[PDB]
Scaffold this motif. Structure first.
Motif, mmCIF file in Angstrom:
data_model
loop_
_atom_site.group_PDB
_atom_site.id
_atom_site.type_symbol
_atom_site.label_atom_id
_atom_site.label_comp_id
_atom_site.label_asym_id
_atom_site.label_seq_id
_atom_site.Cartn_x
_atom_site.Cartn_y
_atom_site.Cartn_z
ATOM 1 N N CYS A 48 3.224 -41.059 -37.626
ATOM 2 C CA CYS A 48 2.741 -39.774 -38.114
ATOM 3 C C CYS A 48 3.589 -38.691 -37.461
ATOM 4 O O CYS A 48 4.405 -38.984 -36.583
ATOM 5 N N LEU B 177 -1.493 -42.742 -43.999
ATOM 6 C CA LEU B 177 -0.380 -42.099 -43.308
ATOM 7 C C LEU B 177 0.931 -42.164 -44.091
ATOM 8 O O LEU B 177 1.552 -41.136 -44.332
ATOM 9 N N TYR C 1 -2.708 -36.917 -37.398
ATOM 10 C CA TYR C 1 -3.872 -37.778 -37.245
ATOM 11 C C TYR C 1 -4.902 -37.102 -36.335
ATOM 12 O O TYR C 1 -4.604 -36.760 -35.186
ATOM 13 N N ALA D 8 -2.383 -44.975 -34.948
ATOM 14 C CA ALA D 8 -1.741 -43.891 -35.689
ATOM 15 C C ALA D 8 -0.252 -43.752 -35.392
ATOM 16 O O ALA D 8 0.569 -43.711 -36.317
ATOM 17 N N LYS E 22 2.650 -39.032 -46.338
ATOM 18 C CA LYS E 22 3.967 -38.660 -45.845
ATOM 19 C C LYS E 22 4.936 -38.378 -46.997
ATOM 20 O O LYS E 22 5.946 -37.704 -46.819
ATOM 21 N N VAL F 290 2.380 -35.436 -41.735
ATOM 22 C CA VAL F 290 1.048 -35.980 -41.491
ATOM 23 C C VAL F 290 0.558 -35.910 -40.048
ATOM 24 O O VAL F 290 1.277 -36.270 -39.111
#
Ligand SMILES: O=C[C@H](O)[C@H](O)[C@H](O)COP(=O)(O)O
Ligand SMILES: O=C[C@H](O)[C@H](O)[C@H](O)COP(=O)(O)O
Lengths: 263, 255, 263, 255
Positions: free
Chosen positions: C215, C169, C180, C210, C173, C178
């Motif tokens: 994210c 992640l 998930y 996540a 980035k 990003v």
């Protein structure tokens, strides 16, 4: 250089089992004179998955049984140690002291084995990269070991599975003699829950691969009746199949030998 | 209560332990919600190189750990490497730690369980989460009652570890789970930038505690210099995981 | 920045199924105004394991159904393409063109998507390392893409298993937003032989992880009755559970947000 | 008979193909026991970088491949990347190759099968050996009768591939198996020193053929420069695997 064949029952279930296997190994040593045989059997399975699994009858009984094998057949002996204090008593009978895969990084154990003056064979940890065995050999040499072996026994590949990265054979050959563990490389760690699994159908093909790539010896667990073994019943090779397997790898080794790369 | 096991990787000197011990004591008073446990190894018995730092020995180690518990009243934890060490270590260690490579060594587990102390087993990099059930069974068979399983990464190719967070809920079925925030990002044979991110993940998923190696000056540490957390950053991270836990706990799945 | 929630039935089983899910997603978009919702559904499952598995009713039918969803609910749309020629027709309705994981390295496909002027979301291949997505983003930017997303959907971990390396992640980035993928990351590739498996019990905890890491959005397949789905029946989230999951991740995101590291 | 698929990775120029084609023709006459197949890609459609070499196009490619088959009478193989390419490629290619990343693309497989030609599917780095059974089924459903499955390594951590030789006997249950000796040692995103060692392993285990990328001057290759085998070493390796195969074949397990 003489090819090494380390073989015998996984665990010392009884002194009788040892003499039965030892008899066959002795017969083969007379036939395959270009091979250096070493009889193997653990006096203790100190890392079984389940507390309910067979471990052994103790060091005392084990060393005694191993000494009987060496005494009766004149065969070299190897067995593994699990704690430093065991190196001395074991060295009294073992020509090669084996270091378990999970313990390949335990400095005191390696040092304990090295100072006995005996040869030392370290099973490569399932977590270890081939190039990281260089330091393992360094520790041993530091501790006085003059004859060192590194055994390929598979690498962690996802859960409950091991893969053999044959690139490891020529890499490890740079700093030690290399042995291929034909029976543990196909086991499925904790595959059966309370015990590990294994796929016997892959033992032979992978051992052929090993000698084709090139190694200094092979390690094979063999039992008269694997299905009745107290450990590794799914991977131990039936004793009657040993002769044929050895002939085959010697044949493959011979034809492949001229192509073995120089390190 | 939530467990926070922290301290310097190796006992480089009881002097160092006292410094780190002072900060952990201070945080201990600031976060009454948390149960702190001071950790430090008296011996790095599994270094890759023969020429690397191992320590000052069990005696000097147990002595230094005694000084920390007496001077600060903090619980203690350290790891053992061979069976004989269990008894003498149990004199000071409230929690006996079993190394990852040694998580399958039956005698080491039994020796630790027999001391009556709590046992924390680092999950081997070669172990599947469900395979820890048998590990717990060994300890129970040995008389252990306070058992912990620590997530510290799984072998992922060569010289790399991945943290499969599915392990937390799985291991929780048979033991309290601790997340090792510093060794999980290490590269066998690590990146400090991933320590905080993954620890946040661990508490969001749900665990019973976190394990963190902290040192006043990680750059000068004789062990895990690339991953030990700077002492001054410990308070911030603890406060962070407590806040995340507070909100996320509402969603932790039952058993 | 507005958090993205990409959700919808895995496959366009029927235009009816789409309107049923679209209705709920529209309701949630009215409730969670801080979230940017994007309705997802594949007009074709072009990579099923078995030739006997459901694929879809063709692009024509699919785009038509997706357009109905956008038309009826005013929801943004995303769907995946499998060959270059599909980018143009799909771009007529899709706000975000999705690139399948197995095809994340197919240069012409990425270029085809990029020139449409639409946003592009690339599923990270199960064979790809996080740092190797830098070149994927480079290809897209080269092809004219201005809004790019990289979706984490697990990495090959041994056979028939995927692991989520959350270190990916913050790494990804560095060069793109990003996302998930909460439902595909828990699937067990070819786990059921003729079809892939999956463990639904891990969807929620991993999605919490996540957002804790940080994210820019989450991707979730949801179906009124997963057990009756024609694809990913083991991993699609029951539609009635969507609201609760979203509330939870927004809560976790909020409390964790102040600790998100700056790239 | 044993198959040996070889040639330059990419069609850098039909001139290059003719040079390599001459050597493969010569070996073809020297080893009548072996069925040689000339291989070269008209397009590297999956390069990591947008700035890397892709090729001169399908037309220029199929043309150059025609020149090789006409001038030397060698069978041909090249890979396709999208369905529409199957038909025009089938004009020259005796064997249509399916890229590893595309081994699950149903339409690509069906398009290749529909041409009537033989199809060789590179096993994806994400695929388990037993999962290739379904791949074969797709091709059979599409009318394919001469089907091959090629072992080219499996994802092992990041930027690394491992060859699980257990795959050879497994895939053999439903298709002829080819071992890719050059891509199996490549590091995604390789070591030439492992090419020969692993190819020896492949024949010792048992396979139906080997795939090798060869170039007069690998160092100058526009693709796979680190793994392409120097042309001059091809004869020696072929002779080596034939001898190993001769002895080992006696032990290949049935089906
Ligand atoms: O050192 C470990 C041995 O090679 C085996 O893999 C071991 O004893 C297997 O143990 P279990 O069957 O109890 O998991
Ligand atoms: O792109 C692939 C999807 O995410 C699935 O994992 C796929 O459609 C699963 O296919 P199957 O169940 O046919 O293996």
């Amino acid at each position: 250089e003489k090819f090494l064949v380390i073989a015998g029952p996984c665990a010392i279930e009884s002194e009788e089992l040892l003499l039965k296997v030892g008899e066959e190994i002795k017969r083969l040593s007379e036939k395959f004179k270009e091979v250096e045989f070493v009889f193997k059997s653990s006096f203790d399975k100190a890392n079984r998955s389940s507390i309910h699994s067979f471990r052994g009858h103790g060091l005392e009984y084990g060393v005694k049984a191993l000494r009987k094998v060496k005494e009766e057949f004149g065969l070299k002996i190897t067995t593994d140690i699990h704690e430093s204090w065991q190196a001395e008593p074991v060295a009294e009978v073992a020509d090669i002291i084996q270091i378990p895969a999970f313990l390949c990084r335990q400095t005191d154990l390696l040092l304990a084995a090295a100072k006995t003056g005996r040869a030392v064979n370290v099973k490569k940890g399932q977590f270890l990269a081939p190039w990281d065995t260089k330091n393992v050999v360094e520790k041993l040499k530091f501790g006085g070991a003059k004859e060192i072996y590194l055994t390929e026994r598979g690498t962690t590949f996802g859960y409950n599975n091991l893969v053999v990265d044959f690139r490891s054979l020529p890499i490890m050959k740079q700093w030690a003699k290399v042995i291929y563990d034909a029976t543990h490389s196909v086991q499925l760690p904790g595959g059966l829950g309370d015990k590990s699994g294994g796929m016997r159908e892959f033992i032979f093909p992978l051992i052929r691969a090993a000698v084709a790539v090139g190694c200094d010896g092979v390690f094979m667990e063999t039992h008269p009746e694997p299905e009745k073994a107290l450990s590794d019943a799914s991977t131990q090779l039936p004793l009657s199949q040993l002769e044929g397997i050895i002939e085959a790898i010697l044949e493959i080794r011979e034809v492949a030998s001229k192509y073995y790369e120089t390190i």
